[PDB]
Symmetry: D2
């Protein structure tokens, strides 16, 4: 069966929710194993307690932790990260910085890579976070898949919404209060289904 | 006086309107000369008639045409382009491809470069069009100015809006029907005022 | 058979020579049909937007213009609006190669900004994996990036594409074709 | 006086050597105060987010990690939330330099993605203009981009930064300082 890994960091739960929607879309293709994996936290125990994040992260506390070498087991990996000033977050960056051995062994070469994100504002890194993420995936020799415009949600012009042709996204607001909308989750579902379709066509032809 | 040039291509008038708002913001600083300049059209006379664009472009028909060498006269240049698949349009690209002589003479080195855009969808090249534009400005040795988050419009979370920390923007919709909103025009005004402030501080210190 | 189109613009011939190396790499894989097409401002036919729909993969070649594709390529792609709204390139393999005057003036940025456009068309993006040894060459001035093959033209365009640069290009052709073929044979 | 901070992470010393060249370039201009600060995982003090507010310009140095800044730099910048909402870096000059194992594996993309973050902080971005002859060197393998200075470390990190690469770095320091100073003296 086609193995799809969804590897994400989340502080407030936005990326976690999008991840579940991505997973749901992927499972629609059939002959597919979808696995959610979270990246290790870096933030100090205390800062974590004081921020409330410790509480928020607990909502998905039972998700197993990703490791650099487990990535080699997948046919596709869809990475999720909140933006930090238009780049991936340091938690995701440290995790990927750890894939040096995976790199020299060629472990991700020819695998399908895709990305999704979340931001506080409408155009603060909705796109740049994804495209800079793509750079690292290309270093790993992955094939890059985004979200085609055959998904109607990408052209929605009546509600504020994330979702880019580079990859799905969601808006969290300044204070992280806004939860992902149905349009945003529909776009993520499509991404998971689309990535899984492509990975399966590649995987069934070793 | 500090010379600010606003150099743009527009098909349907969206970029033209944003350009006027950028100009208005710039004129707020004082001791500043602001000049609007349009880039030459490439589209065939016939395709132009049949598209209705010939009509739309006429609304700003009296704007003088930019040339590669006139750019050397400015202290800052703020470039406007509609997106084409997350890059600047071919009209703007051909114009900039013409600046080879300007490049070897160093004519734009140390000048303030800024960019604004327009797109059909919320995250189809709102950011990527600007950042890829920045690359060409860096080749010309320009100092890059975007839109700081001290402009409240960048964090607007109640209306669909363009405007990025990389540069102002507007949404035109799938059929180009949506006109620039007040929030979008306010952000452009701020960009013009902010670019002009910086250029003036640099220009008054040769 | 898998259909590969190599769509390019070339002034000095650097891009054309790279294209020939890409095509030879692609034609190594077997049951692969490669067509070279040039974009309009010599016996290479001109590309049209409609013909692109017939490919399983398109490998685009452009010299840089200040870190973007050239206006000739930009104008060509600006004519693919019809293809876009019909979904004509969705799921097809996209790949890019370039040429530049200087060692780091747009070797990378020209390709990555090109990728943006291929993503708008719903394409699947392929670069050059580091299993190609030429990417880590540290003994001779060389183009070639993980994002796609490249060549160095020099200030006056006198510099010929090197053997290292062409072999990277050959690899990109073979690798892109191998990917396209696996997709093409699994409709 | 104009205050320049050079904030960097260095493993092998390549980035540190580049920083020393940037600082020497900056200190050429006169009435310029340059401080080197390193980001946390040696007698260079550690950077903090609050000290950055005291600079007129910040020049950031990072080795690449697959075409992005390294996690140590990323984590440091992720702690600048307070600075951000207070507007503490708005209008300050920002500039970047890097180091990579291979000739086109993130020489450019590492810098341009760093620029994104500096733009979120409202900074004014400065690269390296082509009036610096080293940028067009075509005789020796060399780093140095119009986006910012760079050095090549090699696969094992054995390669020393060359004289061409350091002179480009020196230029970037001088050029950034010259810009910062003109702004600093025109409040």
């Amino acid at each position: 069966p086609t193995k799809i890994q969804i590897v994400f960091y989340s502080s407030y739960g936005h990326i976690y929710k999008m991840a579940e929607a991505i997973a749901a879309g992927a499972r629609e293709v059939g002959d597919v194993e979808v696995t959610l994996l979270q990246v290790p936290e870096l933030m100090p125990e205390e800062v974590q307690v004081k921020s409330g994040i410790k509480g928020y992260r607990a909502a998905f506390g039972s998700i197993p932790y990703a490791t650099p070498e487990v990535l080699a087991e997948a046919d596709a990996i869809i990475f999720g990260t909140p933006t930090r000033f238009g780049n991936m977050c340091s938690q995701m960056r440290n995790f990927l910085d750890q894939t040096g051995g995976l790199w020299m062994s060629g472990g991700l070469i020819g695998k399908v890579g895709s990305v999704f994100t979340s931001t506080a504002s409408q155009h603060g890194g909705q796109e740049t976070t994804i495209t800079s993420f793509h750079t690292t995936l290309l270093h790993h020799g992955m094939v890059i898949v985004g979200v085609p415009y055959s998904e109607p949600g990408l052209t929605n012009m009546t509600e504020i919404s994330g979702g880019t042709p580079y990859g799905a996204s969601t808006l969290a607001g300044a204070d992280g209060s806004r939860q992902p909308s149905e349009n945003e989750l529909q776009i993520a579902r499509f991404q998971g289904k689309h990535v899984a379709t492509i990975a399966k066509r590649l995987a069934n032809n070793k």
